[model samples]
Target: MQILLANPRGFCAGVDRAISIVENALAIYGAPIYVRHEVVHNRYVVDSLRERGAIFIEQISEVPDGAILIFSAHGVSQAVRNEAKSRDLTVFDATCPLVTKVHMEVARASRRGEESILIGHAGHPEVEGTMGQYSNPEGGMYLVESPDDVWKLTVKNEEKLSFMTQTTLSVDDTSDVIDALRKRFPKIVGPRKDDICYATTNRQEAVRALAEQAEVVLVVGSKNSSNSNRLAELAQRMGKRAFLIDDAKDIQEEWVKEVKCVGVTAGASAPDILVQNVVARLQQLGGGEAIPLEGREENIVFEVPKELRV
Candidate 1:
């Protein structure tokens, strides 16, 4: 048995910056600093921060007035920002810059009198937040999760439709949906740059490469992580058996029973330590060698907000 690790598998720049924002806020502002959501969808990261005095809440109302509040990496809607301001909370936005770029695209499209279409899963925080940026009273942005959903869209102006996507979606899946959209609305426009971030693209490409050599693939990410789920799904689509697990403990002994090679990858929010632990455990369980698949090297670094920097 052998272990194949995916390069660029864990802790992308945006996740690092968001987690650091919480940690720095805790250090500078003292305990009970409020964070709007699980900072990046990883329980281990959230649990560790909770132990250090960060309070996670789902709504702005739950935060005490005037307390320091941090938005999750998934950017919030304009209404949520207004609510935070109304409460007089000292605010630090930890939204990934790429996600913010999507929001800006939506805003710019709206200003041009174009109806916005968002390519993302409904109810995901990032989707909700991005959709919220639209201010059209009669119904602004539309959410389409797949190519099928694109056919069902009824826009106010087909000639003025523009689209943006969630940063964490599967690239191939998104391309299919984009193809469907173009077929339906010949004039639909999109962001000048791709909305799916580089980290997501690189990790998925690595897993796709790994799928060719490994019989079973393990993606280390929490159940709620969109990008993590996409990685596992991509492997399955490539015809390899894959499981999305939080860590090594979730691995089943039977999963690798008949496999000659196992591929291991992690989502952007996941820590590399989890991947290391998974490798070590696999070795103890009869996996003889571990080799990292040579893949794209990521050097993207999002700076921590200046206010939080020492």
Candidate 2:
């Protein structure tokens, strides 16, 4: 058995920046830095941060007054920001700049009193945050999870509509949704390109190349991680047997036993160490040297703020 590795896998620039914010905050402020949500959606990363004094909380009320509060990489709504300010908290925004861009787009549209449609899974933090960005009594905010959602969608003003997508969606799937919107609302405007972020695009592209060659695929990511789930689903869509696992320990030896080749990749929030452990486990079970597959050359870097800089 041979192990095939996907290039440009795991730890995108956004996740990289978010994690650094918490880590640097802890290092500088000395312990008990409160983060509004799971910083990057990976439990391992969150747990590791907790051990180093980062507190993960679900609501603003959970954070104590006069505490240093940081928003997760998923970004936050205007209401949340206002609430944070209502308290005596010191805020550090770890929202990914890409997600911030979408928020700004939604915000600008709201200011112009235009309705907006968001293409994304319901209740996801990023979706919630992006949806929260739109606020106008005359206009509205809508969410479409699928083509069916788009078909059933009824907007107040079709001519004054624009659509945006979650950054962590399947490129192919999102395209289909966008096509549906275009057919139904010809006047609806949208981003120059869909809002799926660079890291998400590159990782999915790499997985496509991996699925083409390997008989089975393994994606390392937490269950709640949107981009991670997309990686596994994309592989399965490509007609390969794929499994999403959090770590090497979750790998089932039986799945790889008779396989000649296994493909492995990780989500943007996933750490490379997990991928390394997975390859080692695969070899221990029954695999040869892991070989890297050629894929996109991702050189994009989102720099950390001066406060977080080492």
Candidate 3:
């Protein structure tokens, strides 16, 4: 048996900066630091941060006055930033630059009186924060999850519309939605580049290379993570067996027992330690040497906020 590893898997620039902002803030400010949301989707990572002093909360009202607040990698709305100002909470922004770009895209669309169409999963923090940025007084954005959504979507201005997306969506998913939207609204505008970020594309591309020869693919990530889930789906869609797991313990003996080669990859928010542990688990399950495959090398680095330096 052989264990093949995806080169560009795990911990993208955004997730890297988000976790560091919490760690650095906790290091400087001490424990009890309030974060607007989970900084990372991995359960192990979040639990570790929780013990060290980072308190994750979904609502701004949950945070008391005079506390230090750090926004998650998914940037907050203009209203949230306004509330932070009025509430007197000391703040650090860990929002990824790519996500902020999407916010600005919607902001400009709203400013121009064009209703924005957002392509993203509902209930996702990124979607919530992105949709919150649409401030058009007369009616605003619509959320579309599928081509069917485009058919039924009723925009305030079909002629004056633009679209943006969550940074982590599956490329296939976004591609169809874009085609559907453009077919329905011929004049609809899109971003200069599609909103799915570099890491998402790189990770997915790495998985495709694995899908070809690896009999079973083990994606190391939390089920809740968007990019990780799609990586597994991408492999399965390509006719390879894939499972999304948080760590080694989640793996079932039945999945990997007889496969000649198993591919291991991690999601954007997953840590490298989990990937190594998964490799170890694979060895224990059936001894094999882990071989690395060539994939897109991600060199992008999102820097931590300057406030943390103070």
Candidate 4:
């Protein structure tokens, strides 16, 4: 059996920077650094951080006053910031720059007296963080997860409407949703820039290529990872057998016996270690050659916040 891996499959710059923030905080401030959520939505990464004395909390109130709290990569709403400020907590924001761009668009639209429509999954930390940016009863934003959401939407003004999406979403699905929104509200405006980050686009493109050549595909990522799930779905949609597994332990012996070639890709939040371990498992089962098909080259880098530098 031969194994083909996807290049640029793990640890996008955003996840890298987010994890670094916690590490640096621990190095400087010592153990017990508080993080609002999983720094990047990866269980492996979170476990590593926990072992190093990073406390992951679901609510801002869980963090004590005057403690150092770092927001996750998904960014936080004005309310989160305000709460942190009110509690006199020191904050280090690790929001990905691309996500910040979407926030800025919504901010600008709100300033121009326009209603904003955020297209993202409900209950996601990123969605919560993004939606928190706008206040209700004065400046409000709508959330849509599907094409049918368009009819259910009740914006204050049709002409004063703009739409933005989460950075990590199914590219083709998002386009379909956006198209439906545009058809429903002809005046609805969208981001001047592509909200989907380069890494997400590149990973998806790589998986699409893999789907073309491989009979079975496996994506290495957490179950909750949006981009990772999308990659697996992309392959399955292309008529290839696809599975999303977190690590080598999740791989089944039954699935391997029937396949001649397997393609593997990792999610942006996933670390390279997981990918290598998965490949090692494949090799241990039966030695095989591994090749990675190159897709897009990504050069984007986000800097750690000034507080961390100091």
Q: Identify the candidate with maximal TM-score.
A: 2
Could you give me the TM-score of model 2 versus the true structure? 0.98
lDDT of 1 at 234: 90
Stretches > 4 Å off in candidate 4: none
Per-candidate count of clashing residue pairs (backbone under 3 Å): 0, 1, 0, 0
What is the TM-score of each predicted model, taking all chains together? 0.97, 0.98, 0.97, 0.96
> What is the per-residue lDDT of model 2 for residues 209-301, given as tens digits with 9 covering 90 to 100?
999999999999999999999999999988999999988899987888799999999999999999899999999988889999888888878
Question: lDDT by residue for model 4 over 228-286, one digit each (tens)?
Answer: 99999999999998999989999998777768888999999998889889999988877
Q: Give candidate 1's TM-score.
A: 0.97
At residue 47, candidate 2 shows an lDDT of 90
Residue-level error in angstroms, candidate 2, position 84: 0.3
Query: Looking at candidate 2, what is the lDDT of residue 253?
Result: 76
- State the C-alpha lDDT per candidate: 0.91, 0.93, 0.89, 0.86
Query: What's the CA error at residue 109 for candidate 4, in Å?
Result: 2.2
Estimate, for each residue in 1-310, the C-alpha lDDT of model 3 and write its tens digit. 8999997899999999999999999999898999988887888889999999789998789999999999988788888888888897998889998999899888888788778899999999899889989987885789999999999988777888888989898998899999999999999889765799999989888998988989899999987898899999999999888999998899899998788899999999999999889999889988488899987767898888787753
Clashes of 2: 1
